[PDB]
Paper text:
The ferrous iron and 2-oxoglutarate (2OG)-dependent HIF prolyl hydroxylases (PHDs/EGLNs) catalyse trans-4-prolyl hydroxylations on HIFα subunits, thus promoting their binding to the von Hippel–Lindau protein (VHL), a targeting component of a ubiquitin E3 ligase, and signalling for HIFα degradation under normoxic conditions. The PHD-catalysed hydroxylations of HIF-1α/HIF-2α in higher animals occur in amino- and carboxy-terminal oxygen-dependent degradation domains (NODD and CODD). The three human PHDs exhibit different NODD/CODD selectivities, with PHD3 being substantially more selective for CODD than PHD1/2 (refs 16). Biophysical analyses employing crystallography and NMR reveal that the molecular basis of PHD isoform and variant selectivity involves enzyme–substrate interactions involving β2/β3 loop residues (that bind the LXXLAP motif) and helices α3 and α4, regions which display sequence variations between the PHD isoforms.
Analysis of a PHD2.N-oxalyl glycine (NOG).CODD complex structure led us to propose that certain erythrocytosis-associated PHD2 variants (P317R and R371H) would have altered substrate selectivities. R371H PHD2 retains >60% NODD activity and is equally active as wt PHD2 with CODD in endpoint assays; kinetic analyses show R371H is less efficient compared with wt PHD2 (for R371H, kcat/Km is reduced by ∼50% for NODD and CODD). Structures of the P317R, R371H and R396T variants with a clinically used inhibitor628 reveal similar overall folds to wt PHD2, that is, a modified double-stranded-β-helix (DSBH) core (β-strands I–VIII), supporting 2OG and His-X-Asp…His-mediated Fe(II) binding. The structures suggested that these variants probably manifest altered substrate binding, but do not explain how their differing NODD/CODD selectivities arise. Comparison of the structures rationalizes the selectivities of the clinically observed P317R, R371H and R396T variants. Arg371PHD2 (βVI-VII loop) apparently positions the Arg370PHD2 side chain in ODD binding: Arg370PHD2 interacts with both Asp395NODD (electrostatic) and Leu559CODD (hydrophobic); substitution of Arg370PHD2 with alanine did not affect CODD hydroxylation, but gave ∼35% reduction in NODD activity, demonstrating Arg370–Arg371 is more important in NODD than in CODD hydroxylation.
Residue numbers in the entry: 188 to 404, 408 to 411
The structure:
């Protein structure tokens, strides 16, 4: 499906109505599996961190660590299909220009690849950008073949602002997710009991990012 059609007929109206949008079968099986192979190779070759320190025990060998990350630019050897994913995300956002709220996206982060190792850790409730740092859209791509949350957990639970309900999103293979990064969307990752991979990119709003430079100072003489 052409990126522009997906953007105009789905992403734009969904984001303006719900602020949370799911695209299944984004890249297709072949490409999705190649991305999975690249992420697994990063893991198997030691490129991820050891994981977020969750619980400190008196014996440090018993410390519990959770999500593991690595930052990816997309041109690294062994990462070019991740790069292709990022370019595909960028093309979608570009086709949405000037239609996602009143935001004007002019840049993004590198990709944050995350691995929940399957040891019952998740991620606490949080907002991605609560303090005006420039990030307006979160884009996540999931890689987990035959993920079944009733068995393996790892649901992303989002709590759209001022709603008596939440939205549970399974981290399914070849699924792409968009949501507003600010306080519209507090969210959490429920405990994961199998290896769970995702790739996140954040897109910046031009105005917010420009004035974030002021708030968070950059020196000339
Ligand atoms: O993986 C998901 O479905 C949702 N994950 C997150 O919301 C998430 N958010 C943040 Cl800000 C971080 C931040 C650092 C490491 C992992 C994160 C993460 O998985
Ligand atoms: Mn988050």
């Amino acid at each position: 499906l052409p990126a522009l059609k997906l953007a105009l007929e789905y992403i734009v109206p969904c984001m303006n109505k719900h602020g949370i949008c799911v695209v299944d079968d984004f890249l297709g099986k072949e490409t999705g599996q190649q991305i999975g192979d690249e992420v697994r190779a990063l893991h198997d070759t030691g490129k991820f961190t050891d994981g977020q320190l969750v619980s400190q025990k008196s014996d440090s060998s018993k410390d519990i660590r959770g999500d593991k990350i690595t930052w990816i630019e997309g041109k690294e050897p062994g990462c070019e299909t991740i790069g292709l994913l990022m370019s595909s995300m960028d093309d979608l956002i570009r086709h949405c220009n000037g239609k996602l709220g009143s935001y004007k996206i002019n840049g993004r982060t590198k990709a944050m690849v995350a691995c929940y190792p399957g040891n019952g850790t998740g991620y606490v409730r949080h907002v991605d950008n609560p303090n005006g740092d420039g990030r307006c859209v979160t884009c996540i791509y999931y890689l987990n073949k035959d993920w079944d949350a009733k068995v393996s957990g790892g649901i992303l639970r989002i709590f759209p602002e001022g709603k008596a309900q939440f939205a549970d999103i399974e981290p399914k293979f070849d699924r792409l997710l968009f949501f507003w990064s600010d306080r519209h969307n507090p969210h959490e990752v429920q405990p994961a009991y199998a290896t769970r991979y995702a790739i996140t990119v954040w897109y910046f709003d031009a105005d917010e990012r420009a004035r974030a430079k002021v708030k968070y100072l950059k020196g000339v003489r």
